[PDB]
């Protein structure tokens, strides 16, 4: 049973965190809530940490003052299909073992399913740990609560004795590294470096090994992650987030800048031994757009290679941990801007981009943006009660299960039926044209072989190479994004359209060039 | 508010008009409800139009008096699944982009939906007008019954000031040409000479510049496509099924001359300066076999090559709108009497025939179909009331929605899920002959660029070539007809294994071709 | 049908005229609705010869709004049918006590669809001795036929006498020819204002309410809320009229500026 320390003692040396608490709504919350500081305060001067506090980061911490939250934050759609491959007739990607070759994620892609397993299911996908992590049972999958209280109370690693990352199951790759963690957990947001650069007083870092650093996690998408825990206030933690809208200033909205100065992020930095140690960025509004930016976008987090002259980026390299913060027809500058790739095809030869789920820089533009919508307003709005304090819903899901709230509050003259019409008919649409796309990039990806073996000349192999990226980024978007084209429906049909055009083009010229070689 | 017309004035020059209106269901109808004829009247001789009256062909014009028959006929089936392309494993062709090739169709091909649509979605199909008319909002999908009303109430022209055809976004095609449209409206029913001749009457003909026709038409289905305005009397109106039915004395079902004597159309006439101009047929019953195969039958409404020669048939030549009037085994006899074919397969170089939704020549000679069943029997029934007078339905869809009036009326002695577990079969097994069918016909189309490149001889490329012809007819017949089978499931059987037979004989002679010229 | 010539009937009927070509029924013949063809060989404006037909069926109207028709045939199945009021379940369980020996005490049932009103009003305990009877306890559901015509689905058990009698025990015979105009307007060329005594009326508040019964078909009339001539919005009971005009009461009378 708790009992209340004296906060006046803390704020003596933490000012800042004064500053913050005694002025919002946590102004009552006293800090045993959530740190257990006795040692601490017996050792520490104003500048040592002396012996360190415990701090609590489970978001069952949160749940003695709000468990209608908590309860949703915790809550399991059991009608997203759970583990369901991409590559796959009955999903997204049906030909992507062709279009990706090689590439990690070829050992297993799959649908997203709710945010309370969203640590274990990192932790345990083929691709991640070379199956080194494994669920206890495979009874354990429905258990939504049991994740958020902790992975490993779910989940086991079958050999606790090595650290190093290696396959226990033929069919895994290891391409988990610690960045990726920051979209899964926020338990390590005071071990962990602003960017995750190495220093004197974080644990963990880019250069880490990654399975020590994740035996140290256990809670899923924590909820300070979006509210401050001092203060209350709408936040963002996620530091490449922070990083390219604050440190190279291009804006909370980067194609909008008059709405970049309505919704701003002020940062906040807090130091170890008197250096810059780790960052949040306050916002003005609780604009879910950029809480759910933090993770619901395209991204670096992981090595790849330089465009000018091949040579490894390895993890020790920022570009590493990296937001590209840009629409699909702003995508290949902004990749030039870091000369960067992510893998060469194994098949054709074509330096490539890695694409992965980009909603907000899609719903950028979109009707819906444009006339200030937010993610939670279809995703995550308040519960409705005839006779109750009306809170809001914590565990995002598809409109379709809450339609009145979503959709109808604003388009009143549509039935339920109306308005799931209306977004079947956009994402059939677009799906036709994702297949389309997948259909020519399969077919001019087939001919590389062809003509290789043929004795087509490096030039016109390196003419369709180049085609080869654009073709790649412009249909690998949209099965990386995932609302098959709701979130803008006029952008996904311009850029699967030039997907396919690209692919035309490539089929063409090595049609051409076999035919003449031949023979 | 209308003012009655003296009827008996018109009727001293409109002696036809005078003999159908007084002797039917509308004789108490006066002309005001759907003509507005002031300055005709002032102006007209026994021979010159003079002021040329207006003739309001909205759907709507019927619904003062038909309010229930209205409605139904606007009404939208949420559950067909809206603009779902076909070329994709989730839909009826996966393989369609390797089988059809550079054809139109291409471009996009999506499973038909509520007849309220037609129009509309005729206009904004990707395979149609380059993309020039779009929907005005993403929104407006859902509504029937303002398509109804009018296509340009709802979808709008990316540039009014040009009538070219040409593409406003990169994949999509030019397809669209005045014949199409005769299965979309009969909005210009006074516009436009039978058959689609020029003529000094007609402001459109098979000739016209697409686009400027297009701006002209606004309503879907018509009602007096199926019903004489003036008597009440079914008819058909629809100039190609008139030409085969009567001019080439082929029957109302050219399979049975007996059932061809108890069904038939009698031709009317009109004229315009003393020469025919336009034609109905009048139907001696109600058969919707007859309605509904005024469009869902198999049809040239569009430019091809000769068989003989490969020259070009243009828009100018009657054989661009024309109905075939034959079952699958007799169409390749029927398109060699016209001496056509539709496109040259890109890859393989074959003549091939296009088809499309043959239904009523599927249905023929079918166990329904020799029991006198009619398409409206199974998909526009009368409507079921305790305490009303019971009229038809309007918009016509599958009978899984109205199982009891649509099946089990007749067959007393199975439930719904009996009926709907009797179709599911034939349809399943139908659709696994397909998926084969595509399967083979993929796998000889695929060896034809190996072949080639291999050296083998234009004498085995040209057996195989005629192979491909009837491998495909006896494929795509199956994927362009709707009820996967159901409507004459021994025929598709026969059919498709007939196509399976082909392709497995080219790929034979292929492989045999190609090992031989290695190795 | 074939049309009429109307503006030969307009010659004598003027007010007619000035009601039918102003409205939304302009173009709707006279034919749909009146038989003349007698009338006008036989009439001047001064005499009206043979009486023409006016056909008085709901299914007059349906051959242009089915959709109002189907809707006002319709039943609700949900409403109890033939449910006692004095009854522990109903509204009134004590009122045997109450209302004693009044008619009423023979039977009074809870409201149930339009359709059937002229029939329920026919066949009550109360009304008519038992003399008039569904034909067969099956006919209860049918609201359609009810619509269609009363005498289609009830029957009068003896049709050689006109006198209100008791045939059934517990019954009584409170029906007089006022009842039937908030049941029918069938009769509405046949009775005076108020039904008063009249040389061109055949049924007034003083008929044989047997024989008047007998000449009535249909309940609720399509033109008892909507003119025939004009389509205009009216009432056509007269003594609703008498308490809005005669009484001067006006047609809200607790509120003079509505
Ligand atoms: C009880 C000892 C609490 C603990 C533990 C947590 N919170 Fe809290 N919170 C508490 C109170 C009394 C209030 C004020 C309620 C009021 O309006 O009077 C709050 C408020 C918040 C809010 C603010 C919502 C708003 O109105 O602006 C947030 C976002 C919030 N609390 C979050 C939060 C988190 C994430 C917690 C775990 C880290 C947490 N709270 C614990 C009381 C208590
Ligand atoms: C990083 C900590 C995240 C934040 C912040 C948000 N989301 Fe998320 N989301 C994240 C992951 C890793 C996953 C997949 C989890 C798994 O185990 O597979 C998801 C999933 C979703 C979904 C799909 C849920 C389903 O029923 O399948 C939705 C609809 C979604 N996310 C939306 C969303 C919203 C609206 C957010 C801001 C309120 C948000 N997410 C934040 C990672 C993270
Ligand atoms: C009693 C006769 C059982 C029946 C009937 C079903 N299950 Fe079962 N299951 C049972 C036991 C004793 C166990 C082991 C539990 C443990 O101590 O670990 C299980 C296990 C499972 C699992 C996990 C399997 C694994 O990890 O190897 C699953 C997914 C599971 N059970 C599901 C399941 C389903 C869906 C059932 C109905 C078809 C079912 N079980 C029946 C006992 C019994
Ligand atoms: C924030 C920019 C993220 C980074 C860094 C990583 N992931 Fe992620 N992940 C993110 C989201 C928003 C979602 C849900 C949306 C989706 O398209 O899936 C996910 C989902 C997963 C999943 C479940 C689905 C699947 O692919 O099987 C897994 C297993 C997963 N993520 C693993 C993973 C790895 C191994 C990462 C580093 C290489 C990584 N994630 C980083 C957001 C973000
Ligand atoms: C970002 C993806 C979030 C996470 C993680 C958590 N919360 Fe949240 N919270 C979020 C939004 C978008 C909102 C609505 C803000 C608005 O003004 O519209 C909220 C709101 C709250 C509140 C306020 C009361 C309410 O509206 O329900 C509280 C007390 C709260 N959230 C608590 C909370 C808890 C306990 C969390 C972990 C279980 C948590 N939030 C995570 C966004 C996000
Ligand atoms: C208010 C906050 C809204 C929410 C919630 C939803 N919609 Fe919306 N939508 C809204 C506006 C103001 C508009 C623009 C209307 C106009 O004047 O043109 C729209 C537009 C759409 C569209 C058309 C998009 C386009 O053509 O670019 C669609 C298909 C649509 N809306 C659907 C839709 C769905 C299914 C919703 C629930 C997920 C939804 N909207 C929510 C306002 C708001
Ligand atoms: C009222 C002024 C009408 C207009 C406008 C339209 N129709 Fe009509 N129709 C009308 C009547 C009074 C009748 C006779 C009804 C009866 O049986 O007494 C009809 C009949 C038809 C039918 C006949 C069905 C049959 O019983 O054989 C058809 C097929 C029909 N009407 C079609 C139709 C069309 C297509 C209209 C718009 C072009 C139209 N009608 C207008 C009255 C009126
Ligand atoms: C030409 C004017 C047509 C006539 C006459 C008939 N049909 Fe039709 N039908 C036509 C088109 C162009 C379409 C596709 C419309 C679109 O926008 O996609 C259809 C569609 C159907 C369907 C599918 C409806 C659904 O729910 O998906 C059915 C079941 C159908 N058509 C049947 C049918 C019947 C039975 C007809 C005679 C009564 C009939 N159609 C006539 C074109 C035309
Ligand atoms: C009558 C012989 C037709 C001719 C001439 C044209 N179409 Fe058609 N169309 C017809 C039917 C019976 C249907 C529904 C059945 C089906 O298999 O689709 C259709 C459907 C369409 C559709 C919607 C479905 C789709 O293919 O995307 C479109 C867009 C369409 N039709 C366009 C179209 C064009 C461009 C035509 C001239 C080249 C054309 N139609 C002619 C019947 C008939
Ligand atoms: C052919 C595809 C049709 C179109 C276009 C329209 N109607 Fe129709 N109608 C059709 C059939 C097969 C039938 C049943 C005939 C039979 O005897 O079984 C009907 C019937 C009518 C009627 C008669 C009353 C009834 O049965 O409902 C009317 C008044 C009628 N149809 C009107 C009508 C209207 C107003 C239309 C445009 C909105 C319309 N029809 C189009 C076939 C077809
Ligand atoms: C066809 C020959 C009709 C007959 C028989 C009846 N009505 Fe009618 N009615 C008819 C038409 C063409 C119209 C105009 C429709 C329009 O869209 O404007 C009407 C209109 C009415 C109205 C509505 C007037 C308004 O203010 O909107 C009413 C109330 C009406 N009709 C009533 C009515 C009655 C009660 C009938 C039987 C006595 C009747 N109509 C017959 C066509 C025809
Ligand atoms: C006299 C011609 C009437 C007019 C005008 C209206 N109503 Fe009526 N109503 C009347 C009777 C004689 C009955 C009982 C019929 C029977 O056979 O028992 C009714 C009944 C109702 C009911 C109950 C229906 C049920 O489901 O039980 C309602 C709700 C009702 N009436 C309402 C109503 C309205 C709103 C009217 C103007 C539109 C109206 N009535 C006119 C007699 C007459
Ligand atoms: C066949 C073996 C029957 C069974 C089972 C049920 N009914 Fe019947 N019923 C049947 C006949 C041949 C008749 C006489 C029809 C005639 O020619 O008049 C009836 C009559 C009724 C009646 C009217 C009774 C009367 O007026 O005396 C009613 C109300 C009725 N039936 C209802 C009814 C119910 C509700 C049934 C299931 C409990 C039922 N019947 C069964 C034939 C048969
Ligand atoms: C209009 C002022 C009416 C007069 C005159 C008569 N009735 Fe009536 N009746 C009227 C209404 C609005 C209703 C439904 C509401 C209700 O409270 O019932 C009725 C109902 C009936 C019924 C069915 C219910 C019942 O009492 O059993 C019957 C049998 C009936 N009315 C008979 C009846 C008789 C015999 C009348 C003259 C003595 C009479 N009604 C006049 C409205 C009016
Ligand atoms: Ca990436
Ligand atoms: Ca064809
Ligand atoms: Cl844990
Ligand atoms: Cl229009
Ligand atoms: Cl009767
Ligand atoms: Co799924
Ligand atoms: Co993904
Ligand atoms: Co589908
Ligand atoms: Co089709
Ligand atoms: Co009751
Ligand atoms: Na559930
Ligand atoms: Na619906
Ligand atoms: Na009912």
Redesign the interface.
């Given at each position: 049973q708790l009992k209340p320390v004296d906060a006046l003692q803390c704020y003596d040396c933490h000012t800042q965190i004064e500053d913050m608490h005694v002025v919002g709504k946590h102004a009552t919350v006293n800090c045993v809530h959530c740190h257990d500081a006795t040692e601490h305060v017996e050792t520490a001067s104003a500048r040592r940490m002396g012996e360190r506090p415990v701090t609590h980061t489970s978001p069952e911490a949160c749940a003695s003052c709000h468990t209608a939250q908590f309860n949703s934050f915790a809550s399991v759609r059991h009608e997203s299909h759970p583990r369901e491959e991409k590559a796959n007739?009955?999903s997204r990607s049906?030909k992507f073992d062709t279009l990706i070759g090689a590439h990690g994620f070829s050992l297993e892609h799959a649908e997203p399913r709710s945010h309370a397993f969203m640590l274990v299911d990192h932790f345990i996908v083929d691709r991640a740990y070379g199956g080194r992590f494994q669920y206890k049972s495979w009874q354990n999958v429905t258990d939504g609560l049991g994740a958020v209280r902790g992975a490993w109370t779910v989940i086991e690693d079958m050999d606790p004795t090595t650290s190093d990352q290696r396959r226990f199951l033929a069919q895994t790759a290891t391409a988990a590294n610690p960045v990726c963690l920051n979209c899964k957990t926020q338990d390590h947001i005071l071990d962990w470096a602003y960017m995750g650069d190495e220093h004197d007083a974080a644990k963990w870092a880019r250069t880490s090994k990654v399975v020590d650093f994740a035996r140290d996690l256990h809670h899923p998408v924590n909820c300070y992650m979006c509210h401050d825990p001092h203060s209350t206030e709408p936040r963002v933690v996620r530091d490449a987030l922070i990083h390219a809208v604050v440190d190279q200033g291009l804006g909370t909205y980067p194609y909008d800048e008059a709405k970049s100065e309505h919704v701003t992020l002020t940062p906040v930095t807090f130091q170890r031994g008197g250096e810059d140690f780790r960052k949040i960025g306050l916002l003005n509004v609780a604009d879910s757009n950029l809480m759910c930016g933090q993770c619901h976008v395209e991204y670096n987090c992981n090595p790849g290679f330089q465009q000018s002259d091949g040579a490894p980026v390895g993890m020790d390299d920022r570009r590493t941990n990296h937001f590209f913060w840009a629409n699909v027809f702003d995508y290949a500058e902004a990749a030039k801007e870091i000369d960067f790739f992510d893998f060469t095809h194994v098949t054709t030869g074509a330096p490539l981009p890695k694409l992965q789920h980009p909603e907000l820089e899609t719903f950028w533009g979109s009707?819906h943006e444009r006339n200030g919508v937010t993610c939670a307003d279809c995703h995550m709005p308040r519960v409705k009660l005839e006779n109750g304090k009306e809170y809001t819903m914590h565990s995002p899901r598809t409109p379709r299960d809450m339609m009145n709230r979503a959709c109808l509050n604003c388009?009143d003259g549509?039935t339920e039926?109306?308005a799931?019409?209306?977004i079947?008919?956009?994402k059939?649409?677009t799906?036709?044209?994702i297949?389309?796309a997948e259909?020519?990039l399969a077919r001019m990806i087939d001919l590389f072989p062809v003509a290789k073996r043929?004795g087509v000349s490096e030039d016109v192999l390196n003419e369709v190479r180049a085609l080869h990226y654009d073709a790649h980024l412009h249909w690998e978007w949209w099965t990386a994004e995932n609302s098959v084209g709701f979130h803008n429906?006029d952008q996904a049909?311009?850029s699967?359209?030039?997907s396919?055009?690209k692919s035309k083009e490539g089929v063409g010229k090595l049609?051409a060039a076999?035919?003449a070689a031949?023979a």
């Open positions: 007739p009955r049906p009707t388009h549509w039926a109306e799931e019409y209306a079947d008919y956009i059939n649409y799906h036709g044209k297949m389309k259909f020519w043929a429906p049909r311009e699967l359209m030039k396919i055009t049609d076999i035919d031949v």
